[PDB]
Amino acid sequence: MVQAWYMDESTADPRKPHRAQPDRPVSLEQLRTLGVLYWKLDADKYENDPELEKIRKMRNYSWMDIITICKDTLPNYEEKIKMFFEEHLHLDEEIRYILEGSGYFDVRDKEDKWIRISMEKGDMITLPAGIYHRFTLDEKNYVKAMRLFVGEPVWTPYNRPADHFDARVQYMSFLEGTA
Ligand SMILES: CCCC(=O)C(=O)O
């Protein structure tokens, strides 16, 4: 089962787990109240998986590509990695399907406290437009991921503060309505 937790108070070493002490796990159901959705898939089948297709059609994820994040192969690696981990939001969904390796997506909860989501092979996640988030590799320092998008992609991050955007306003409005 996919693991998520509240983070400790250390600001050092973003790639470590940073589990709060004592443990404060976060359920998939609490993530749903933040509009964060999750599916589990057989990642070996990603080239041809009726179960992925079901998700894509339901959600209108009509666009996809594959990205591989490691020091050696990714162009402009160091800079891209810095940008991923800056707290930011987008005007669209962020949908990522992990094909190999692993990573952390951090999201703010309703009190603006960080929740760390551990994503592994087979895990697929969508972060809603307007949510403040960031991504980092974990200590294994490797991830291969499918990126999906509702239509032709725009990747632009807006680093916090980014509160004026309609996507942020609507997302705040969505949060009033959940548990
Ligand atoms: C696999 C996640 C990396 C990424 O595409 C992002 O954080 O924008």
Ligand code: NI
């Ligand atoms: Ni992002």
